[PDB]
Amino acid sequence: MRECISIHVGQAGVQIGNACWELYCLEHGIQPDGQMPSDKTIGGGDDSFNTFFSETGAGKHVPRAVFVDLEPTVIDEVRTGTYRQLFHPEQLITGKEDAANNYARGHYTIGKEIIDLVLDRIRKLADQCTGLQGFLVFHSFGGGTGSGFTSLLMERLSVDYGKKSKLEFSIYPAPQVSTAVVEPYNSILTTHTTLEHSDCAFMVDNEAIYDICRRNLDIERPTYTNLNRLISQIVSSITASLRFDGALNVDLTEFQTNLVPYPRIHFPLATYAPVISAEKAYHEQLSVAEITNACFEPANQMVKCDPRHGKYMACCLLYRGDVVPKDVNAAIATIKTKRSIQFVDWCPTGFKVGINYQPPTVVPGGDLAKVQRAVCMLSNTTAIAEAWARLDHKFDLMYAKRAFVHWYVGEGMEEGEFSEAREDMAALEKDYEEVGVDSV
Amino acid sequence: MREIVHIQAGQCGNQIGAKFWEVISDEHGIDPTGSYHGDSDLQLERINVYYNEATGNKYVPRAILVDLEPGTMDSVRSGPFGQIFRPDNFVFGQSGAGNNWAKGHYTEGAELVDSVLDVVRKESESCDCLQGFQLTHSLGGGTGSGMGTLLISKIREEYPDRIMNTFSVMPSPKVSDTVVEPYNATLSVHQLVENTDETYCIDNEALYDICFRTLKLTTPTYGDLNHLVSATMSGVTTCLRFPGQADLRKLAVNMVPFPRLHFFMPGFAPLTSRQQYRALTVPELTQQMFDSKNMMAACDPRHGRYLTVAAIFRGRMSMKEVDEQMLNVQNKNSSYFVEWIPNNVKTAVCDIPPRGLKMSATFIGNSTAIQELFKRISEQFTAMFRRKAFLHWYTGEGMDEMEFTEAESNMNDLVSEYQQYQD
Ligand SMILES: Nc1nc2c(ncn2[C@@H]2O[C@H](COP(=O)(O)OP(=O)(O)OP(=O)(O)O)[C@@H](O)[C@H]2O)c(=O)[nH]1
Ligand SMILES: Nc1nc2c(ncn2[C@@H]2O[C@H](COP(=O)(O)OP(=O)(O)O)[C@@H](O)[C@H]2O)c(=O)[nH]1
Ligand SMILES: Cc1cccc(C(=O)N2CCC(C(N)=O)CC2)c1
Ligand SMILES: Cc1cccc(C(=O)N2CCC(C(N)=O)CC2)c1
Ligand SMILES: [Ca+2]
Ligand SMILES: [Ca+2]
Ligand SMILES: [Ca+2]
Ligand SMILES: [Mg+2]
Ligand SMILES: [Mg+2]
């Protein structure tokens, strides 16, 4: 019951999915062949981890996941990698020719040739669920598949599953690791097209993760592997409420109630701590107070923005590991006196807390120290609209000259779709201003 | 044989209800397996009020457990006295209510409600003469609030001349799970105004302050709060569970002078921290019982006036000294009792004390000061509703804004009604 189906779209979605499912297996004690010796109910069960893993009669624990990409080379590494036995072959779907960093090819020219097969595979996963809760969709904003095919898939999932919840983990582009000049175009197009189909979206700014790796982990030139290991820890913190049971556990959906005051205002800001190397963590035990205070350090946010220059509409603290409410309450009291956390006047100001007792885990060969306790803060702040503004400005510079637009028109799109998408973004920026103004 | 049918709905409703049945099962000498092992005939005199007698001298609570998710009732079934409940009396769905009054009242709750009524009807059909019903629930969630008030409405349709009583936990931003609690509580309060005869208002803020300030608990939990609710529920039902006077209707007739003003503030004494073996004198019991700090609605009685007051004293004590102290509290603070209801302060005594105490006192007030509770809720409701904040959770279930505006006016009318009798 309460199953969650994960969908990983494009290179960024697939590679982040690799890191997440490896981490999940380590947290739950699942071996690369899918066996889980601690699971005494063979072939089934209703344990908390069954939200993300189905079971076969042979004792295999199989991720409730589909991997999809329009070219094969990334998913091919999964097919031949360490966890190749984890997935059934039909869960890994590839085409031959990718979207060439063109939303139009991902949503139309190329995506339309594989969308039906993808939906059929998702249906096979749904049929095995006794109480499907919804989907988790991982994808980049900047790639042609991550943008165009994700939006096509989200539209089709609304039709085939109605208002069943769909959450996103969306990779927001940064110049240090970007691969296409037109990524601002693709980002605005998919954000516009997906907006009414997504119930909640966690943006991950690649530049924020890049800075954290360089600053806190002493990684000179972070790679996708470095970035994805950190992203997986944040993803794990957010989904841990769904995969583990506990007296103090609070379900992600209950945080969602507080985080989304209006349908379009559904982009929480995530902050994670502690991010520290083994060399620095040695003999340095980071307390509940220390990791909590770090949550309000802007340098630890998953999206670059200044919450001090906006207003809060919600603040949630998701703890895991050796944490008890007494220490949380004391930590929060301190913060409430040294940081002015300004809420809009129409919203309560109490922090919402959940605790999962299962301690954090790390993948061998990684950069993060193993820690006894960690926290992910999820806040709804008007400041996250800064991320839209930066993207919209790059869009405007190019679109005023119609640079690169012929690539999209040549694949069937119309200039009207660009202005329509950009106007929706302008309205969204204005919405974020409006909700922050005090009531009359 | 004046049977009462007990219903507990949602997470809060089932967790407080489970503790209530643990407390009174102990008082009546009923073990977790339903077998009687007391030593006083007073334990069984009125046992059929809350328990059905099964084969083999087994006593089974006349209780129905309701929820839209399985988690909490799984905990109850595995809890201390979980095995004492009738297995068929567990009625639950899988979807959950998402802290959403509309889901409990109009969609998810609507799909399950008929099966709950089947169990209610079954229990009512085996009653020699049913008094009425008691429901335990919170108002700030979705199942207890939304589906609980749906159940009350359908029970009144099928049993229109039976008394409906609730223990209703009021939300507070100090002890809050979600921000929509004032929405759910405002929607429920109107249902209660229309469809219950008596509602005990239990404010989570008052329960917290008692645990933190008086009981000196550094980190109060929901369990600590429920300990106070269990003790209070046992206190206010003593006169129903032991020889006295008497039944729900007679209580209502002497407590409720106007039909809509049926929301009570309960209180308990002693409330002692761990100096716990000290003997408590009748004056101490009487002074604390009327102290605002001993009350669980988070309303200052000195801000309003008592329409009616009931006080129950438990334990082997001097009934002569009880009257002297009671008559002393009234005749020393008569400015807070309306003078147009003569002799509106009634006192009752019960010989059997609660477990672990030589004597205790329970307080039931129908005070116009309860308007402060409804004012707090109304202000929190409007702060969000002015901006239509979080409404999409409710319109997605088919509700319209007009229903929120009507609930807003209904509760402000209720506040206005209390204010006229306070002057
Ligand atoms: N954090 C992270 N970002 C990635 C990763 N792979 C790609 N990206 C980012 O994703 C954007 C490019 O999109 P991709 O996911 O590679 O493209 P795609 O979805 O495969 O679509 P096409 O190749 O155009 O068909 C750039 O901003 C990259 O920096 C990854 O593994 N981790
Ligand atoms: N006193 C008390 N209040 C509770 C408890 N559990 C939840 N609440 C309160 O009830 C409201 C949440 O409703 P809940 O019963 O959990 O939702 P439901 O399961 O949908 O009915 C909030 O105001 C909580 O503070 C409990 O065990 N004791
Ligand atoms: C479909 C639907 C229905 C109701 C609200 C929205 C919504 O997301 N906003 C953004 C916030 C804005 C405001 N309050 O200033 C109002 C519209 C969308
Ligand atoms: C102060 C108090 C008293 C009694 C119980 C609680 C409690 O366990 N929660 C759950 C978590 C919730 C939150 N804000 O996250 C607050 C209520 C808190
Ligand atoms: Ca199993
Ligand atoms: Ca607007
Ligand atoms: Ca249904
Ligand atoms: Mg690609
Ligand atoms: Mg709850």
Side-chain angles (χ1 to χ4, degrees):
Chain A
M1 204 76 193
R2 290 313 123 207
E3 296 89 353
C4 299
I5 289 180
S6 298
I7 307 172
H8 306 277
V9 180
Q11 170 179 307
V14 164
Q15 298 192 146
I16 290 170
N18 291 342
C20 287
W21 286 102
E22 175 177 33
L23 182 54
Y24 293 164
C25 286
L26 297 183
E27 293 180 6
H28 294 299
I30 294 165
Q31 309 168 7
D33 67 358
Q35 295 292 318
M36 179 178 178
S38 66
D39 180 7
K40 302 305 173 186
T41 52
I42 309 303
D46 60 339
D47 293 314
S48 285
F49 63 84
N50 286 126
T51 57
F52 277 62
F53 292 89
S54 63
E55 302 180 33
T56 75
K60 174 175 293 186
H61 295 63
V62 178
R64 302 185 191 275
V66 168
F67 289 63
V68 188
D69 200 358
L70 299 186
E71 58 112 3
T73 57
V74 183
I75 289 181
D76 268 351
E77 291 301 302
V78 180
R79 298 190 169 119
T80 178
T82 294
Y83 287 89
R84 62 186 181 279
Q85 311 181 220
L86 204 60
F87 308 98
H88 184 283
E90 296 188 2
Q91 297 178 254
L92 312 176
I93 307 169
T94 54
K96 293 185 174 300
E97 185 177 17
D98 65 31
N101 286 321
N102 188 333
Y103 172 99
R105 290 173 56 85
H107 189 280
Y108 301 94
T109 306
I110 305 300
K112 72 180 169 63
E113 303 290 340
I114 203 172
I115 181 60
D116 286 320
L117 176 65
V118 169
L119 285 167
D120 292 9
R121 302 288 168 88
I122 293 171
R123 175 63 64 185
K124 282 182 164 61
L125 293 174
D127 286 350
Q128 302 177 21
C129 298
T130 60
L132 177 62
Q133 197 172 20
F135 307 91
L136 300 178
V137 186
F138 300 72
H139 68 103
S140 71
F141 275 171
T145 299
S147 62
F149 187 80
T150 295
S151 72
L152 175 68
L153 174 62
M154 294 283 282
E155 293 169 308
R156 294 291 292 267
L157 290 175
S158 290
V159 171
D160 286 6
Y161 297 88
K163 246 132 177 53
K164 180 130 300 178
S165 75
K166 302 192 288 300
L167 275 53
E168 298 170 82
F169 285 96
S170 298
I171 310 305
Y172 183 99
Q176 295 86 347
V177 297
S178 73
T179 51
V181 179
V182 295
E183 291 193 36
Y185 282 170
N186 296 336
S187 301
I188 274 52
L189 290 172
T190 188
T191 297
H192 163 56
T193 292
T194 300
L195 189 56
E196 60 191 327
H197 300 286
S198 177
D199 300 285
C200 184
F202 304 98
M203 289 188 292
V204 180
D205 181 355
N206 259 351
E207 190 175 349
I209 300 306
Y210 195 94
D211 289 343
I212 292 169
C213 288
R214 287 193 296 182
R215 177 202 311 113
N216 297 29
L217 298 181
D218 302 313
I219 302 174
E220 279 201 356
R221 207 299 183 183
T223 66
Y224 283 144
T225 299
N226 296 123
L227 306 182
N228 294 349
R229 296 279 176 73
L230 178 53
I231 293 169
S232 61
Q233 292 293 347
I234 296 128
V235 172
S236 173
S237 280
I238 291 168
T239 67
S241 65
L242 308 174
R243 298 177 291 106
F244 297 101
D245 191 60
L248 300 185
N249 184 66
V250 176
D251 199 83
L252 179 60
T253 64
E254 194 168 293
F255 291 113
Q256 243 174 284
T257 301
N258 281 18
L259 283 166
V260 186
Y262 309 93
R264 291 159 62 86
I265 311 302
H266 68 236
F267 299 89
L269 178 62
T271 307
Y272 178 89
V275 179
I276 179 179
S277 69
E279 281 97 339
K280 292 290 182 290
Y282 187 62
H283 285 166
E284 265 64 65
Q285 50 191 100
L286 286 188
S287 68
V288 175
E290 290 172 329
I291 65 171
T292 304
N293 199 24
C295 286
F296 296 86
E297 168 53 39
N300 300 325
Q301 301 164 181
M302 326 302 316
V303 176
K304 300 194 94 169
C305 65
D306 194 342
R308 292 171 283 200
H309 295 168
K311 289 184 184 175
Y312 283 92
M313 291 165 286
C315 186
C316 308
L317 291 170
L318 286 60
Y319 292 93
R320 69 188 310 175
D322 178 45
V323 178
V324 300
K326 169 188 177 180
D327 299 323
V328 176
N329 296 335
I332 290 175
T334 296
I335 290 169
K336 283 182 178 296
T337 66
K338 296 180 179 177
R339 318 230 191 199
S340 67
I341 300 138
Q342 185 71 71
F343 277 78
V344 300
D345 65 2
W346 51 261
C347 184
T349 65
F351 290 11
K352 182 168 175 55
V353 171
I355 299 174
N356 283 99
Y357 286 145
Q358 292 68 26
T361 314
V362 295
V363 178
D367 314 292
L368 286 168
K370 178 86 155 56
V371 299
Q372 292 186 99
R373 62 194 67 83
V375 62
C376 180
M377 183 170 80
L378 301 177
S379 59
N380 181 20
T381 169
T382 62
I384 201 159
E386 288 179 39
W388 304 131
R390 298 194 298 271
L391 229 42
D392 290 332
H393 179 64
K394 297 180 186 299
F395 183 108
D396 289 348
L397 286 172
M398 291 190 295
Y399 194 68
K401 311 290 184 288
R402 300 298 193 275
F404 299 106
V405 172
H406 65 107
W407 286 110
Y408 299 74
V409 168
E411 295 290 2
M413 289 187 70
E414 306 179 356
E415 285 185 2
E417 289 173 79
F418 280 74
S419 51
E420 171 187 314
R422 179 64 182 91
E423 296 173 6
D424 196 14
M425 295 303 298
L428 183 66
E429 288 195 44
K430 182 181 172 184
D431 288 337
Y432 270 92
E433 297 184 26
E434 293 166 350
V435 296
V437 175
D438 292 327
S439 308
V440 183
Chain B
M1 315 178 192
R2 35 188 68 168
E3 293 82 17
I4 290 176
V5 172
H6 167 95
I7 307 171
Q8 51 190 62
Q11 180 166 33
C12 179
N14 276 281
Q15 296 182 155
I16 291 178
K19 298 295 299 181
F20 168 78
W21 285 104
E22 175 174 14
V23 174
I24 69 165
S25 290
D26 175 70
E27 298 185 1
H28 292 280
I30 305 297
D31 70 358
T33 59
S35 297
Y36 171 83
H37 290 283
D39 62 337
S40 176
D41 300 330
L42 296 71
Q43 289 175 301
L44 302 180
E45 185 110 16
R46 311 248 281 186
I47 196 68
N48 62 3
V49 174
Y50 282 93
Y51 296 85
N52 292 320
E53 202 166 334
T55 308
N57 200 19
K58 289 286 186 177
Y59 296 96
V60 186
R62 196 175 299 101
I64 305 167
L65 301 76
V66 182
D67 206 340
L68 286 172
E69 65 192 15
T72 299
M73 284 169 50
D74 286 351
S75 296
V76 176
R77 189 181 304 109
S78 302
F81 287 72
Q83 306 289 318
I84 196 184
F85 297 105
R86 200 180 190 273
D88 292 325
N89 287 20
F90 291 74
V91 188
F92 57 95
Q94 301 290 328
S95 62
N99 288 283
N100 187 320
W101 193 87
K103 287 195 172 193
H105 206 84
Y106 292 122
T107 56
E108 304 297 341
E111 187 176 358
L112 187 71
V113 68
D114 278 357
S115 57
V116 174
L117 293 172
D118 286 336
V119 176
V120 170
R121 189 173 311 102
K122 182 279 169 190
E123 288 292 357
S124 295
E125 293 179 354
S126 66
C127 290
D128 181 26
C129 186
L130 175 77
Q131 295 192 46
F133 309 86
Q134 69 176 35
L135 166 74
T136 61
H137 63 156
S138 71
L139 306 187
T143 300
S145 192
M147 195 189 175
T149 55
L150 182 67
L151 284 167
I152 290 172
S153 195
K154 300 200 181 304
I155 285 177
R156 196 181 179 184
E157 189 175 18
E158 184 168 354
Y159 306 89
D161 66 351
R162 301 295 89 187
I163 295 295
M164 174 65 68
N165 195 358
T166 75
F167 299 87
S168 303
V169 174
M170 311 282 178
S172 160
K174 312 302 182 54
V175 188
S176 171
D177 295 336
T178 69
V179 296
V180 293
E181 283 160 5
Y183 282 160
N184 303 326
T186 294
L187 292 165
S188 278
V189 167
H190 177 55
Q191 302 298 307
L192 301 179
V193 170
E194 280 197 356
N195 292 326
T196 77
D197 299 289
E198 298 167 303
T199 286
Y200 294 96
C201 295
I202 303 168
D203 187 312
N204 263 357
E205 179 173 8
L207 296 179
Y208 171 76
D209 290 334
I210 293 171
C211 291
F212 188 93
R213 304 184 202 181
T214 300
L215 298 182
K216 300 307 182 184
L217 300 173
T218 301
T219 304
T221 71
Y222 277 133
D224 294 324
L225 280 45
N226 297 344
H227 177 75
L228 294 180
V229 183
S230 305
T232 300
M233 292 183 64
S234 171
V236 304
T237 62
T238 291
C239 67
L240 307 166
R241 301 184 285 109
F242 298 97
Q245 297 171 353
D247 72 328
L248 292 174
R249 186 171 292 107
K250 268 194 185 178
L251 166 68
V253 163
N254 289 302
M255 287 294 292
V256 187
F258 309 102
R260 291 183 293 286
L261 310 187
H262 60 254
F263 298 87
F264 304 155
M265 306 192 335
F268 186 83
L271 298 167
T272 308
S273 58
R274 293 180 172 90
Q275 288 293 342
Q276 47 180 137
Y277 311 106
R278 169 187 173 183
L280 199 60
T281 59
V282 174
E284 294 177 327
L285 259 191
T286 306
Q287 301 181 264
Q288 306 181 201
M289 178 183 50
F290 281 94
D291 192 338
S292 61
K293 305 198 305 297
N294 289 68
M295 301 200 184
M296 297 165 185
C299 300
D300 193 334
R302 307 175 76 98
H303 292 180
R305 310 193 73 187
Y306 288 113
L307 304 170
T308 56
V309 172
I312 302 78
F313 290 78
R314 304 184 63 180
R316 306 176 64 255
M317 68 189 70
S318 167
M319 187 172 300
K320 161 192 175 65
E321 192 176 33
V322 173
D323 299 328
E324 294 181 348
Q325 296 298 331
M326 287 303 296
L327 302 178
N328 178 272
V329 175
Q330 314 174 34
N331 308 331
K332 289 183 63 62
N333 312 279
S334 59
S335 54
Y336 304 112
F337 298 84
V338 301
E339 73 288 358
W340 38 272
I341 298 178
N343 314 115
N344 56 339
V345 184
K346 293 307 176 185
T347 299
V349 183
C350 179
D351 294 322
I352 296 176
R355 181 64 93 105
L357 297 187
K358 292 293 181 66
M359 57 184 57
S360 62
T362 298
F363 170 94
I364 310 172
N366 189 351
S367 164
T368 67
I370 197 64
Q371 70 165 295
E372 292 183 334
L373 181 158
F374 299 121
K375 281 182 180 178
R376 289 196 304 269
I377 301 297
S378 183
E379 287 175 349
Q380 297 159 15
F381 174 103
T382 298
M384 294 186 295
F385 187 63
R386 289 186 48 175
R387 301 289 289 263
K388 304 178 175 185
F390 306 98
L391 283 187
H392 73 98
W393 298 127
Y394 299 81
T395 62
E397 305 301 314
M399 284 183 75
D400 187 78
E401 288 186 359
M402 183 63 75
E403 185 164 345
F404 280 71
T405 301
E406 298 173 347
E408 184 180 41
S409 306
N410 288 335
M411 199 161 66
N412 290 336
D413 288 346
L414 181 64
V415 167
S416 300
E417 190 175 353
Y418 280 110
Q419 180 57 34
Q420 71 176 100
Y421 291 115
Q422 182 171 318
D423 311 328

